[PDB]
């Protein structure tokens, strides 16, 4: 189990540790969570009291550095940063957990809900879709765009999505126009899987990753990568028996753990009632489509 | 973006245009089975790309043999539409290929601007307009060299026989919707007018009769006549 120390909670923020969230008062004595998961991703990630705008956070894994918080006055937000002395962070961790400054991973044991939002995400991949590589966290915005987005401004802060477009030379093979629009999956197992992902493992990664950006951050580019990577497949006539059967778990998840209050913008009517109604995969999604007609049987 | 009554001049400035309409692409008869079951027999049909500025008609015959052995015809035949169409681009010199297709039926937007991916500065655009241009195989000539093809074939035609050299290409357009609207609506009524004359002919080289400028106005009067009776005769007014 590790630990994620803070210096001080100088501004009243609400801090949300992977799909918990909790309040901290402007001057409060918190000094961070302890009791992490060891073997997994996390986010830990911030909404000020004063400005709902920008929430803001950070991707990290505790097996790759000691990580702490400290705010920053001048940028005005909560910074990760990496502390290389291990003697001086054990000794900074320890006398906070002596004085139970410290709030715990709530962590239910009969609870799989975090492993099975991030079974395929890895920090290493993670890296790759942002950049700033002298960091090993990696720091995603609500306001932060995808570099598909910037082709419809600023590139060293944008997320670095693979581009996926239906109507693209990339997608269609000449003389097979109508075959490979209406049956993706020319694109989906030999461009993407095959050319671009090398394995489905990687493509799961990034899409959990995507459907993670869009729920915690809000943020508008990554709900758009997700939808993408979910219709590509299911707009496939060919896919390996064993991705359908991964996706509906994965799906399932998401659909599981999204707030009820915010279903209404992170997902698209017409992917969801293709994809579940319509789509050549319109059978093979049976977790995903009995619990969207449960809990969302208004967006369809 | 799409085509209306706002940006209607657009049609005859000096950008290259063709309209697109694959409405008779794919036509059939529907009859009785021996069994007392229903099928369809295709017979010929044709694409209808036209330069609104010019009259130029490239008429590209389907013959029913491009259906042979396929299914979901009426999906093929969007896509069958806009392999024919990139393939005419392709075939045109730079300085004649469009810089814009405007289709008269939305479904052809995605099929077209596939097979053109080759051409990002093509723009497809759809249009706001009810274009009778389904009535094309109304007129003689055209359902003529249709329904005797026995291969596939491209005819070219001036669909404005030599009106350019007397009006505009506005007014052209307007005469040729006018006579196509007519026909949609009332074919018979519609040929008798244009033919009720025995003495005006129309040429071995043309499409519509010889007309007198005084003659189109009479003409372009009757058509007008026509659709709004139709139109009674339709909604009982
Ligand atoms: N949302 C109720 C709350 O305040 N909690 C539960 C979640 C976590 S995770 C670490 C501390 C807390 C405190
Ligand atoms: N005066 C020439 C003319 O009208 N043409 C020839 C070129 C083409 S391409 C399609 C139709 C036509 C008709």
């Given at each position: 189990?590790?630990?994620?120390?803070?210096?001080?909670?100088?501004?009243?923020?609400?801090?949300?540790?992977?799909?918990?969230?909790?309040?901290?008062?402007?001057?409060?004595?918190?000094?961070?969570?302890?009791?992490?998961?060891?073997?997994?991703?996390?986010?830990?990630?911030?909404?000020?009291?004063?400005?709902?705008?920008?929430?803001?956070?950070?991707?990290?894994?505790?097996?790759?550095?000691?990580?702490?918080?400290?705010?920053?006055?001048?940028?005005?937000?909560?910074?990760?940063?990496?502390?290389?002395?291990?003697?001086?962070?054990?000794?900074?961790?320890?006398?906070?957990?002596?004085?139970?400054?410290?709030?715990?991973?709530?962590?239910?044991?009969?609870?799989?809900?975090?492993?099975?939002?991030?079974?395929?995400?890895?920090?290493?991949?993670?890296?790759?879709?942002?950049?700033?590589?002298?960091?090993?966290?990696?720091?995603?915005?609500?306001?932060?765009?995808?570099?598909?987005?910037?082709?419809?401004?600023?590139?060293?802060?944008?997320?670095?999505?693979?581009?996926?477009?239906?109507?693209?030379?990339?997608?269609?093979?000449?003389?097979?126009?109508?075959?490979?629009?209406?049956?993706?999956?020319?694109?989906?197992?030999?461009?993407?899987?095959?050319?671009?992902?090398?394995?489905?493992?990687?493509?799961?990664?990034?899409?959990?990753?995507?459907?993670?950006?869009?729920?915690?951050?809000?943020?508008?580019?990554?709900?758009?990568?997700?939808?993408?990577?979910?219709?590509?497949?299911?707009?496939?006539?060919?896919?390996?028996?064993?991705?359908?059967?991964?996706?509906?778990?994965?799906?399932?998840?998401?659909?599981?753990?999204?707030?009820?209050?915010?279903?209404?913008?992170?997902?698209?009517?017409?992917?969801?009632?293709?994809?579940?109604?319509?789509?050549?995969?319109?059978?093979?999604?049976?977790?995903?489509?009995?619990?969207?007609?449960?809990?969302?049987?208004?967006?369809? | 973006?799409?085509?209306?009554?706002?940006?209607?001049?657009?049609?005859?400035?000096?950008?290259?245009?063709?309209?697109?309409?694959?409405?008779?692409?794919?036509?059939?008869?529907?009859?009785?089975?021996?069994?007392?079951?229903?099928?369809?027999?295709?017979?010929?049909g044709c694409i209808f790309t036209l330069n609104p500025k010019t009259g130029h008609l490239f008429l590209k015959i389907i013959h029913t043999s491009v259906w042979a052995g396929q299914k979901r015809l009426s999906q093929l035949a969007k896509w069958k539409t806009a392999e024919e169409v990139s393939a005419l681009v392709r075939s045109l010199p730079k300085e004649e290929q469009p810089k814009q297709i405007i289709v008269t039926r939305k479904a052809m937007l995605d099929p077209l601007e596939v097979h053109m991916l080759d051409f990002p500065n093509i723009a497809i655009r759809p249009t706001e307009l009810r274009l009778p241009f389904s009535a094309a195989m109304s007129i003689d000539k055209l359902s003529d060299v249709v329904m005797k093809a026995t291969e596939p074939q491209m005819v070219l035609f001036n669909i404005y026989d030599d009106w350019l050299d007397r009006i505009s290409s506005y007014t052209a357009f307007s005469?040729?919707?006018?006579?196509?609207?007519?026909?949609?609506?009332?074919?018979?009524?519609?040929?008798?007018?244009?033919?009720?004359?025995?003495?005006?002919?129309?040429?071995?080289?043309?499409?519509?009769?010889?007309?007198?400028?005084?003659?189109?106005?009479?003409?372009?009067?009757?058509?007008?006549?026509?659709?709004?009776?139709?139109?009674?005769?339709?909604?009982?007014?």
């Open positions: 189990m590790n630990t994620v120390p803070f210096t001080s909670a100088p501004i009243e923020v609400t801090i949300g540790i992977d799909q918990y969230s909790f309040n901290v008062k402007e001057n409060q004595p918190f000094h961070g969570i302890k009791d992490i998961p060891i073997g997994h991703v996390h986010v830990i990630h911030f909404q000020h009291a004063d400005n709902s705008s920008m929430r803001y956070g950070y991707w990290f894994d505790c097996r790759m550095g000691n990580f702490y918080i400290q705010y920053d006055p001048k940028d005005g937000l909560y910074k990760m940063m990496e502390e290389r002395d291990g003697a001086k962070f054990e000794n900074i961790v320890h006398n906070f957990k002596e004085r139970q400054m410290m709030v715990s991973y709530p962590k239910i044991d009969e609870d799989d809900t975090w492993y099975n939002l991030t079974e395929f995400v890895q920090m290493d991949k993670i890296r790759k879709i942002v950049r700033k590589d002298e960091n090993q966290f990696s720091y995603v915005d609500s306001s932060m765009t995808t570099v598909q987005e910037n082709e419809l401004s600023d590139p060293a802060h944008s997320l670095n999505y693979t581009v996926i477009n239906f109507k693209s030379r990339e997608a269609i093979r000449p003389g097979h126009e109508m075959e490979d629009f209406l049956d993706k999956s020319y694109y989906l197992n030999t461009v993407m899987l095959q050319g671009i992902f090398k394995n489905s493992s990687n493509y799961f990664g990034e899409l959990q990753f995507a459907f993670l950006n869009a729920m915690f951050f809000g943020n508008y580019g990554s709900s758009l990568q997700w939808h993408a990577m979910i219709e590509l497949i299911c707009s496939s006539a060919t896919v390996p028996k064993h991705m359908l059967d991964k996706l509906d778990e994965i799906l399932y998840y998401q659909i599981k753990t999204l707030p009820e209050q915010y279903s209404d913008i992170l997902l698209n009517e017409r992917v969801w009632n293709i994809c579940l109604y319509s789509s050549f995969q319109k059978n093979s999604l049976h977790n995903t489509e009995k619990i969207m007609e449960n809990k969302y049987p208004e967006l369809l | 973006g799409a085509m209306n009554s706002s940006n209607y001049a657009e049609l005859f400035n000096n950008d290259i245009k063709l309209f697109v309409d694959d409405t008779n692409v794919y036509r059939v008869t529907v009859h009785k089975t021996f069994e007392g079951n229903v099928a369809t027999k295709a017979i010929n005469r040729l919707t006018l006579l196509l609207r007519a026909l949609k609506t009332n074919e018979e009524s519609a040929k008798m007018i244009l033919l009720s004359d025995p003495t005006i002919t129309i040429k071995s080289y043309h499409l519509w009769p010889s007309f007198t400028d005084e003659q189109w106005i009479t003409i372009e009067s009757q058509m007008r006549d026509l659709i709004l009776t139709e139109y009674g005769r339709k909604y009982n007014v």
